[PDB]
Paper text:
In the presence of NADH, acetoin is reduced to 2,3-BDO by the enzyme butanediol dehydrogenase (Bdh). SmBdh exhibits the typical single domain short-chain dehydrogenase/reductase (SDR) architecture. A monomer displays a dinucleotide-binding Rossmann fold that includes seven-stranded parallel β-sheet (β3–β2–β1–β4–β5–β6–β7) flanked by three α-helices (α2, α1, and α8) on one side and three α-helices (α3, α4, and α5) on another. There is an additional small lobe on top of a core structure, formed by two short helices, α6 and α7, creating a deep cleft in which the cofactor is bound, and where the active site is located.
The Z. mobilis expressed WT SmBdh crystallized in the space group P43212 with two protein molecules per asymmetric unit that could be superimposed with r.m.s.d. of 0.271 Å over 1379 atoms. Two molecules found in the asymmetric unit form a tetramer (dimer of dimers) with a symmetry-related dimer with extensive interface surfaces. The main difference between the two molecules in the asymmetric unit is that molecule A is found in ‘closed’ conformation (that could be best described by ~ 10 Å distance between Cα-atoms of residues Ala93 and Trp192) and molecule B is found in ‘open’ conformation (the same distance is ~ 14 Å). The transition from the ‘open’ conformation into the ‘closed’ seems to be coincidental with NAD + binding and includes the shift of the loop 183–203, containing two helices, α6 and α7. WT SmBdh contains acetoin in the substrate-binding pocket of the ‘closed’ molecule A. Crystallization conditions included NAD + and acetoin, and more acetoin was used for cryoprotection. We interpreted this as both (3R)- and (3S)-acetoin molecules bound in the pocket since commercially available acetoin is a racemic mixture and no other small molecules (like ethylene glycol) were added during crystallization or as a cryoprotectant. Whereas the positions of all acetoin atoms, with the exception of O3, superimpose quite well; the O3 atoms of (3S)- and (3R)-acetoin molecules are involved in hydrogen bonds with different surrounding residues. In contrast, O3 atom of the (3R)-acetoin has three possible partners for H-bond formation: water molecule W71 (2.7 Å), Nε of the Gln247symm (3.1 Å), and Ser140Oγ (3.1 Å). We found that the substrate-binding pocket is formed by two protein molecules, not a single peptide as found in all other reported Bdh enzymes. The side chain of Q247symm is involved in the substrate positioning forming a hydrogen bond with the O3 atom of the acetoin.
Residue numbers in the entry:
A (entry chain B), B (entry chain A), C (entry chain A), D (entry chain B): 1 to 251
The structure:
Amino acid sequence: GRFDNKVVVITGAGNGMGEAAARRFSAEGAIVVLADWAKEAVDKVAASLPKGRAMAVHIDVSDHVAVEKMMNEVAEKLGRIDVLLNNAGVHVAGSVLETSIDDWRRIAGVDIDGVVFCSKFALPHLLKTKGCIVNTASVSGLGGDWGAAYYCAAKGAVVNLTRAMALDHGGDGVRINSVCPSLVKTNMTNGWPQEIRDKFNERIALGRAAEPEEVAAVMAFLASDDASFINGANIPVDGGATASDGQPKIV
Amino acid sequence: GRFDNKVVVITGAGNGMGEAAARRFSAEGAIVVLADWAKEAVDKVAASLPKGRAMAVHIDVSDHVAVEKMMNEVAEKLGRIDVLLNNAGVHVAGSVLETSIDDWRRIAGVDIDGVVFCSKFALPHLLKTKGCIVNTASVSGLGGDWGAAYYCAAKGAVVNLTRAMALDHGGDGVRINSVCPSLVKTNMTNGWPQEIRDKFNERIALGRAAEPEEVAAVMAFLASDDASFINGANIPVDGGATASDGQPKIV
Amino acid sequence: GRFDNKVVVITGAGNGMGEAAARRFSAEGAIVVLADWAKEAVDKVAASLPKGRAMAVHIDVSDHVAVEKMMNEVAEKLGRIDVLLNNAGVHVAGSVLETSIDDWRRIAGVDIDGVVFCSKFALPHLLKTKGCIVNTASVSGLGGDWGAAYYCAAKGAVVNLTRAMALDHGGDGVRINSVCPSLVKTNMTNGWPQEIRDKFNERIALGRAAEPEEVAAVMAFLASDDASFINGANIPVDGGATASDGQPKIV
Amino acid sequence: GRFDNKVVVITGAGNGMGEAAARRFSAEGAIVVLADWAKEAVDKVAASLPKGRAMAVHIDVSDHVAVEKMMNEVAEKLGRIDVLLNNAGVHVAGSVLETSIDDWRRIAGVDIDGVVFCSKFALPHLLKTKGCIVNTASVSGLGGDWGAAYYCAAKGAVVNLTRAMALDHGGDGVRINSVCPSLVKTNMTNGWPQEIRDKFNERIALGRAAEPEEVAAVMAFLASDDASFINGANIPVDGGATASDGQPKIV
Ligand SMILES: NC(=O)c1ccc[n+]([C@@H]2O[C@H](COP(=O)([O-])OP(=O)(O)OC[C@H]3O[C@@H](n4cnc5c(N)ncnc54)[C@H](O)[C@@H]3O)[C@@H](O)[C@H]2O)c1
Ligand SMILES: NC(=O)c1ccc[n+]([C@@H]2O[C@H](COP(=O)([O-])OP(=O)(O)OC[C@H]3O[C@@H](n4cnc5c(N)ncnc54)[C@H](O)[C@@H]3O)[C@@H](O)[C@H]2O)c1
Ligand SMILES: NC(=O)c1ccc[n+]([C@@H]2O[C@H](COP(=O)([O-])OP(=O)(O)OC[C@H]3O[C@@H](n4cnc5c(N)ncnc54)[C@H](O)[C@@H]3O)[C@@H](O)[C@H]2O)c1
Ligand SMILES: NC(=O)c1ccc[n+]([C@@H]2O[C@H](COP(=O)([O-])OP(=O)(O)OC[C@H]3O[C@@H](n4cnc5c(N)ncnc54)[C@H](O)[C@@H]3O)[C@@H](O)[C@H]2O)c1
Ligand SMILES: Nc1ncnc2c1ncn2[C@@H]1O[C@H](COP(=O)(O)OP(=O)(O)O)[C@@H](O)[C@H]1O
Ligand SMILES: Nc1ncnc2c1ncn2[C@@H]1O[C@H](COP(=O)(O)OP(=O)(O)O)[C@@H](O)[C@H]1O
């Protein structure tokens, strides 16, 4: 019962890590708000969890007015917010020469503005509960990739905003951390050519992709009392990916 | 002259480190495009430099339409672009709880969008000259501050965009690097109280604020042949600030 | 019990975070080997734990002959090794100009050699259990201090040895990670003056020193199944210390 | 004449980067001490440089008594030391399971003790000239490699000792920085199988190995007045290697 009666708001709750986060927190006694643009996935997850202990909601995290209303209505209806998981995301592939101003606006709106807005509007509620924030960043926020320029800029914004907010609020009893996953098994990635999955298994020392549960576990730890002295941290959940200096594996 | 007949585009060239960069590159033979939204300031710097070797451009770098036009106009008139200094920036002080959505739009528009747009629209021209980009990020992009949340997110994006674009374009002969200053003596920090400045002399092991010329020296180095194997680097120009683990002096 | 019948070897187990780790793992069902060169201290901790579930080993971990023997003796008697906590450490204060070659030999022998030897001689046993290593490094290994030069070099080695061994062994089912505390309330720092401790409450955003139990909590997490995809990570347990760019508070 | 009449002591002066460093500094007016275990290479380089402006000397940098005598004799004979280049090195290949205690002693003696000892004994001389230190670290000190455990520990010690010493001495006017090269063209590496050199050209965005001159250039910059505000920095000279989060290049 690590999260007994704690109110956990999950943005991007309809993706693999979002759903694994929702089930892990629920299993540990949390009341879970599954917030997402899309309705089907979060409605199905919410319906699968204990009645009265899960609600699905529509949100555009790129919309600060909608975000502010969502955060106040959750606090009004459930009386508290204890945990924010900023798990919404969009990915676009390409260099800045292969990706449009529009692509940049899309990445920035969800991957940066979403973290800024949901953290700003949850914080007054988190300050009352001495709750915490866990951002879903990425190894792509700790270092660059080939062919994901906008994505790397945005997750780099999330990684450093995590540090800055942690300094601003940690002394008022609200810890702010991120998880920085590498390759996570979804149907997107299960479908990838074998040649591509092999290149990931070579660069990742554990030699496999993460299960979404393996990332949700770290999110749950970082929201737990055991993480009482972890603040402003960007935890690589990457089987060793970012532990390399970038030099090739030779035997 | 290290920069003899090289076209150097410098955003935020009307003041501080941009101005110091304009004088240093001009002294070393560069033709300098001075871009700024402070029309009088940038006109004065432009006019102070050798006739026919400097042109002022009145531009808000947050405007992708204006930026695209400037980069193509410069290329047409001067026949080339060798160096982009993404130096234009604005600061705002406070946590996300003390700074408005409008403060965020101002920070993100100049400090992220301006870097993204100027990089994107210069790059086709830099690919022809095998030129380079030097972003002015900040130590505020390599880690967090207390009370500059939006600025830290923005410079966070600049730091990781520097890495990603370096991976994308280095193989095509275009190096992308940043300088990451700590306290520099400019209009951006001239209002900051004495007790904060005194704490900077403690946290910076060199025991003083930087002169703008000291950062312009590193921008010139990073645009030089001597930096031919430096790519995707965020060079701290901070007198040791980021070298510290954040702990106070042990003795 | 998360660690039911797991053999956990803990260096520096007679005091501070090693002791707290011994109690936490023991509480969670571990059989604990308590290694220390403080024979009375480690005997007292060992004797305080459940009978037949703890053994004290009087060892100087800087001694590769003694370390090789302990690791093989433990494996013989207990039939397995599941977890190594490389926690033993000594501190010395000063620049290289104020600390002797003998100070360096003491720092390097315990703080680097001891980690290297214990890791090397445990690893054949951890490969059989698909166990893990948790190094106790320091924020003093992720960046510099004023006046702990030798200690910073040593913890520097621990941090990057953690990354390299993670790449070497993660694919064989052995995860290698560190915890990087800042100020923790132990014998190592109990002599440090009040003015320095007060500065720590400023530089640590949580505004307090860590309890040893708060670091032992993260060691237990990193040795747990919930850390199944964390490998080669240097987890800061520093209340935000390393999240800062080193600058003093901006407001 | 950037280094006119400045006394530059280069350890490891007989290797590719050592010789390129010696020629670059000499070209800029330096008086160069070429210090190395081996005699032939440094004698030949010294004999090739202006008479009265270069001397070759034997040193074991693993020997603190010999190092201390060398530093005092250079200061006695030439009257000053302005620059230390800590460029001595030994590499060993393998995990900790493939490399002996002896291998560790060899790596630690030259790659750590050499930097500690030469910096300790030069410093009193550098404090009189407000000179500087440039450590030859490695990307292998900024992150791990597969199959170089001891090497990664040692260069990780050099990277963090650089930070610590920079904090200790930068306020007394002695800046301390490192260069962190990746693959550098030598005959060792020119001879490598094409399959291995291809894997380096893939991970390095510039798509090639560094010339030793490209690393020497960065050493010369970091010792120059242009680097007046760079202190405690570990400059990647790696064509982008460490700019990657470790994820594979996919197209
Ligand atoms: N001063 C410091 O201590 C410090 C520290 C770290 C980094 N920086 C960065 O250094 C860069 C230069 O700032 P500075 O300290 O020289 O300040 P400054 O005020 O002296 O100069 C900044 C210049 O940028 C221009 N500018 C701002 N927004 C613009 C826009 N939208 N379009 C065009 N021009 C614009 C301003 O008019 C001004 O001339 C910024 O990116 C800043 O964030 C400053
Ligand atoms: N949207 C825009 O077009 C826009 C927005 C911001 C500012 N600007 C331009 O910036 C310029 C200044 O406007 P502002 O409101 O930012 O300015 P301001 O009056 O706030 O002054 C800007 C900075 O200059 C410093 N300063 C004052 N006197 C100075 C002097 N003699 N020399 C150098 N620095 C001096 C101030 O202390 C301050 O740090 C104008 O040209 C304005 O058009 C453009
Ligand atoms: N206390 C802090 O603020 C702090 C901060 C960061 C990291 N650390 C690290 O935490 C670890 C634990 O230290 P602590 O703070 O719990 O101190 P402590 O003094 O409470 O415990 C350290 C223990 O290690 C033992 N030890 C030392 N050298 C040994 C050797 N050669 N062989 C065997 N045992 C040996 C000591 O006898 C002692 O029991 C160390 O590696 C230390 O560097 C301490
Ligand atoms: N070469 C070796 O074998 C070696 C070297 C160092 C110490 N040790 C062992 O460490 C132990 C202590 O020796 P030392 O000289 O390091 O000790 P010490 O007298 O310096 O005390 C060690 C630490 O314990 C603290 N302390 C004092 N009273 C305490 C108490 N009642 N409970 C808990 N902590 C207390 C002290 O303030 C100090 O921080 C001995 O068992 C000694 O054999 C081993
Ligand atoms: N504007 C938005 N507001 C709220 N949630 C959003 C928004 N944009 C994307 N999301 C959600 O973020 C989650 C993560 O997106 P993504 O990383 O693309 O997941 P997946 O790869 O599994 O499709 C999704 O559930 C998606 O619907
Ligand atoms: N104990 C030592 N004292 C002084 N110089 C040393 C010592 N050990 C190695 N060196 C020198 O360090 C330099 C760099 O070594 P290394 O990296 O192996 O160079 P290379 O790969 O070109 O042979 C060499 O010139 C070598 O002789």
